[PDB]
């Protein structure tokens, strides 16, 4: 599955890493410029740290950049 | 329109001491102290040496420009823009500025000055070597300007997922709670934010 | 008339070093020290480190403007106005300015500069650990200007604010002016003498 | 009784809090910009701290802002 | 064309705060910390006093001139040129500048600012009196500008573990690794780029 | 003529670095150190921390104006006038200026700059805890300008310690300003310089 | 021609940053450190606090004037002239300038800047309490300019003045130049290396 | 006797305080702007501190200001 | 053998110092303006410090200035 | 004998102080503006400190100023 990788703008070829993921969390640099987001693909849906905010999915390019 | 010609706009026609008034409407200032590192502590003299990012923010709409086919954000110097006359009421020492004095300015007139700061402070240090920890009050607000000229509002976030892993101390909980206070002459009230730094020693 | 145009008035036509004279009439300066926090004390070297607001005030009438349908008060920088050349005679160290160097200026020509200050001082520290406490003199007055150019006059519950959190507590502050004549010139180099009575906390 | 509350400019509805009150005291920020004042309403006339200066009353809006 | 007339070019037509953009192409900044002398160390407060040359470098192409029958290099002041807004994230104290604030500027638009610096730093001092030594992290990167405006890249020629680093310090250097770190934030095109220098060091024994 | 117009005179037409020459005639500088407070003393390092008013004075005649029906004295800033390039030869630290940098200027062209100063000094501290006390030499004189450009004269008797802080760890015995003219092997005359002699000791 | 009109010449037409080139011919800088007083010494940290006159000298010919029936020497400020970008390589702290920042300038284009300076220095302090004394190296040279742009040359008994009243006494000072070539540019970044041999006093 | 009082420029009514007096002494602020002088009237001629310099008299206004 | 001596640009006369040599090494001042090089002539090819980089030769002027 | 006295430019009347003298020595202030020189007259030729450099003579004005 092709999923949007970070810190690149673009989509890349993951032969079944079965998920596109969207980690999102608020740090110190955050009240201005926003939650940090590390996008990418992986074998399965990741573990969740407490307060960390997730979004898994399975459509070819289903995890793009918000604002 | 290019970067250069934007700074040419701002530097030449915006006025360092002319508070961006929109008649009878204050300047919406959004402040925050994000605490980085607690350095020197003196339970006996109720003196703290601290370092923090005075995450400051506002709306100066005169600056604004047409960003459609142009750069959405540029970085301006402090010297060429208007700045809040903010001040730590319970301040001991002057502001030791670490970063370059620059602020980010968006096309929509939003302004982001967040300097890194070292400053000493008289506050409640009573109770550092406890589980509860000392609660340390730092009052800050405009010195000269009052509410209807400048309004200060504090703001989610794990306040101490960044706070240095490497300090002699560790942070427990930070609560920014605003405080509006009226004086006996003038329309309204000299607004001021009160940040509450609960902290303690490391094992 | 708007805020900007008022600062345009003051910045462009007022003169940082031209003492606002009204012929043979001095400039009415109203001073006060409001003591905030006593930091370092050394009974042995009669050295105090202190922090206070040099509540300063005066009448510059040239500034004045028509405020009727316009803003009553604006905040100007120190750099663009005239300022009293005040000075602590028994000063050890320079002025460490904490607040922004700005003064408030009313339409009627009244000027409010009150900076926050850290400065060390040679004074009578003899008697800190007593019930009576040490009585600490700080003399301050213009350095260059004399009475008929600048007159200084001391104007609360003096210790309802003074930091609850200092090593020391304030007893009583008395500002008592002192006029003194010198052997040449019309009158007398006026100067205020603030009397800070204080002691060690329990 | 409707009394002028602080730090708001305006009058507000106190179903018998029986008094409008006017605390006034001199702090450090005071010789320039004046005594502090907290206005409001209450059940009964408040206790007096030493040096603190008071003014109670019972006219619908009797405790407004001064300039002196 | 003479030295004077080149500084006249640069001083008069280049703009201290106008980031030298070449549309959508960042300004290629090449950084390095060359560590000179470790002064004060406090294992207890994880506080280091250090001195280093913030070997900084870039491409400002507007400056450029015709050097054929003219001087290839001149020395400009910092005040009259554009400069990276770089900043030590884990900095305690301000920059104490030792050398003159001047940068070298080549005809082809290359710019060499390397100041000597004294600055204190909060970092991992844990493990000074060991054979392994303490490994001390110093993060630095632009404060305001992000990647597609300014890109920072460390060079690393495996340049002498410590051939210069003062023979005369209380401490001796073991190994320095500059390893870049690109990080994305949740609003804007890409990522606020920042270099993380790794100073492994120990006491003189 | 009014105060403002006088400062307009001086600020606009007087030149901070143009030494007020009257051809081949120096600028008559009258100096004095009035010692205020002795702070830090270290017999071991021969280091003194002291505070004094560098009572400086001179004749700049270009400034002068018609004071008949006008103000006799005004106070000017240092930045807008010419100043002596005086320098403490045996100085350790820079000048820590306490008062505002302003000088008084009379209509007749007389100029009164007396700043309050904190400065450290290498001097003879040998003998502090004595009845005789330590005698502490401080040399000061122009750095660049020599005699026939600038002449320095201590023009003193005075009981210098009726003011000297009653509240110092130390007390002053006797101060003697004694000038010292010295010739060098090139130039017309001699780089003039004042040597102040601070005798002092410890209280009880 | 009078004093004022000479400073008018120099201030208005000389250029603080334009290195006085005479084509392919460097600027002849003559340097010397005359050591005045050794303050703090720390054998353990190889740290010295010292005070010295960086007796600096050069030839800027553009300044020159007709002195025949006019003043042979005048005193200029540093801010209005060109200055060597000299720098102590092994410097710890910034330059603490004591005297007024002025240089003397002769009619023939000779320039004499000798400031009084306090600066700390990392150097060989090993061997202070000996008869031989510690020998303390201080390297200094231009930071940016190399040989064919600026040439540095060191040019008495150096104890006749050195404070009679220091904790320490001077033995011998040798200024020995050091020419060094780098792998790009015509020649060699010239730099002087002063050698301060000294010791603690008797007592 | 009417004597010139300080720090006022003017003469004032002392029904026999029998002397007009002129204290003059050199302090620290002195080598520039001069000896300090406190003028006034009194019952008798005052005591003399060492170095302090005096001048008593008995003519209605006999103790006025000098010029240097 | 005539070899290029440093820090001079020019060639000089060594009657049999049998080698022209080219020392080159990277210091701290080096990532910008390059390896240091001291050229010259000598009796035989020199000893090698570790990391130091050498180049000996025997043609009259065989060791000139590069750009690296 | 009339000899040039210092720090004055001019010649002065010594009835037999038998010598005009020219002390010259290098101090710290010296590499720029030169050796110090104290000129004058005296009874006999003076004692010599080590490194100090002398010049005695007996012609009416025989010890004048040099230039560098």
UniProtKB/Swiss-Prot annotation, chain A:
Q: For site (Binds to both neuronal alpha-7/CHRNA7 and Torpedo AChRs, may be important for inhibition of GABA(A) receptors), what residue positions does UniProt give?
A: 36
Q: Identify the tissues in which this protein is expressed.
A: Expressed by the venom gland.
Keyword Metal-binding appears in the UniProt entry: no
Q: Which UniProt keywords apply?
A: Acetylcholine receptor inhibiting toxin, Disulfide bond, Ion channel impairing toxin, Neurotoxin, Postsynaptic neurotoxin, Secreted, Toxin
Q: Mind telling me which GO cellular component terms the entry cites?
A: extracellular region
Give the consequence of mutating residue 49 to E: 3-fold and 53-fold decrease in affinity for Torpedo AChRs
Modification after translation is described as: In homodimer alpha-cobratoxin, selective reduction of Cys(26)-Cys(30) in one subunit does not affect the activity against the alpha-7/CHRNA7 nAChR, whereas its reduction in both subunits almost prevents alpha-7/CHRNA7 nAChR recognition. On the contrary, reduction of one or both Cys(26)-Cys(30) disulfide bonds in the homodimer considerably potentiates inhibition of the alpha-3-beta-2/CHRNA3-CHRNB2 nAChR by the toxin.
Q: Name one GO molecular function term.
A: ion channel regulator activity
Give the result of residue 36 to A, as annotated: 16-fold decrease in affinity for Torpedo AChRs
Detail the disulphide connectivity of this chain as listed in its UniProt entry: 3-20, 14-41, 26-30, 45-56, 57-62
Q: Which CDD domains match?
A: TFP_snake_toxin (cd00206)
Q: What is its main location?
A: secreted
Localization in the cell? Secreted
Q: Which superkingdom does the taxonomy of this entry point to?
A: Eukaryota
Consequence recorded when altering residue 27 to R: 31-fold decrease in affinity for Torpedo AChRs and 50-fold decrease in affinity for neuronal alpha-7/CHRNA7 AChR
Site feature (Binds to Torpedo AChR) residues:
23, 49
Question: Which residues does this entry assign to the site Binds to alpha-7/CHRNA7 AChR?
Answer: 28, 35
- InterPro entries recorded: Snake_3FTx, Snake_toxin-like_sf, Snake_toxin_con_site, Toxin_cobra-type
Q: What else is known?
A: Negative results: the monomeric form has no effect on alpha-3/beta-2 (CHRNA3/CHRNB2) nAChR. It does not show any blockade of the nicotine-evoked release of dopamine and does not affect ACh release. Does not inhibit the homopentameric alpha-1 glycine receptor (GLRA1), when tested at 40 uM.
Report the function annotation for this chain. Monomer: binds with high affinity to muscular (alpha-1-beta-1-gamma-delta/CHRNA1-CHRNB1-CHRNG-CHRND) nAChR (tested on Torpedo californica, Kd=0.2-4.5 nM) and neuronal alpha-7/CHRNA7 nicotinic acetylcholine receptors (Kd=13-105 nM). Also inhibits GABA(A) channels.
Q: Which family does it belong to?
A: Belongs to the three-finger toxin family. Long-chain subfamily. Type II alpha-neurotoxin sub-subfamily.
* Assembly, per entry: Monomer, homo- or heterodimer with cytotoxins 1 (P60305), 2 (AC P01445), and 3 (AC P01446); disulfide-linked.
Name it: Alpha-cobratoxin
Q: Which organism is it from?
A: Naja kaouthia (Monocled cobra)
According to the entry, what is the taxonomic lineage of the organism?
Answer: Eukaryota, Metazoa, Chordata, Craniata, Vertebrata
Curated annotation (Swiss-Prot), chain B:
List locations, semicolon-separated.
Answer: Synaptic cleft
- Read off the PROSITE patterns from this record: IG_LIKE (PS50835)
Keywords of this entry? Disulfide bond, Glycoprotein, Immunoglobulin domain, Receptor, Secreted, Signal, Synapse
Q: Where do transmembrane segments lie in this chain?
A: none
Would you list which residues are glycosylated? 66
Disulphide connectivity of cysteines? 123-136
A GO-annotated cellular component: synapse
Query: What processing steps or modifications follow its translation?
Result: N-glycosylated.
Q: Which Pfam families match?
A: Neur_chan_LBD
The Ig-like domain covers: 95-196
Q: Which GO terms describe its molecular function?
A: extracellular ligand-gated monoatomic ion channel activity; transmembrane signaling receptor activity
- Please tell me in which tissues this protein is expressed: Expressed by glial cells.
Q: What family is this?
A: To the extracellular portion of ligand-gated ionic channels family.
Q: How does it assemble?
A: Homopentamer.
Function in brief: Binds to acetylcholine. Modulates neuronal synaptic transmission.
Q: What is this protein called?
A: Acetylcholine-binding protein
């Amino acid at each position: 599955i092709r999923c949007f990788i970070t810190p690149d703008i673009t989509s890349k070829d993951c032969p079944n890493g079965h998920v596109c993921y969207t980690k999102t969390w608020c740090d110190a640099f955050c009240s201005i410029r926003g939650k940090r987001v590390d996008l990418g693909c992986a074998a399965t849906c990741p573990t969740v740290k407490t307060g960390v905010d997730i979004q898994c999915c399975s459509t070819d390019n289903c995890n793009p950049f918000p604002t | 329109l290019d970067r250069a010609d934007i700074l040419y706009n701002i530097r030449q026609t915006s006025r360092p001491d002319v508070i961006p008034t929109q008649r009878d409407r204050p300047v919406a200032v959004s402040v925050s102290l994000k605490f980085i590192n607690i350095l020197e502590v003196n339970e006996i003299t109720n003196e703290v040496d601290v370092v923090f990012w005075q995450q400051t923010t506002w709306s100066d709409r005169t600056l604004a420009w047409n960003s459609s086919h142009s750069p959405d954000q540029v970085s301006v110097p402090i010297s060429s823009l208007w700045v809040p006359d903010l001040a730590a009421y319970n301040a001991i020492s002057k502001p030791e500025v670490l970063t370059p004095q620059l602020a980010r300015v968006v096309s929509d007139g939003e302004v982001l000055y967040m300097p890194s700061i070292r400053q000493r402070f008289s506050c409640d240090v009573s109770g550092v070597d406890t589980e509860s920890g000392a609660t340390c009050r730092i009052k800050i607000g405009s010195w000269t300007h009052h509410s209807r000229e400048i309004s200060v509002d504090p703001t989610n976030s794990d306040d101490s997922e960044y706070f240095s892993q490497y300090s002699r101390f560790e942070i427990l909980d930070v609560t920014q709670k605003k405080n509006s206070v009226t004086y006996s002459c003038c329309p309204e009230a000299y607004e001021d934010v009160e940040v509450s730094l609960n902290f303690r020693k490391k094992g």
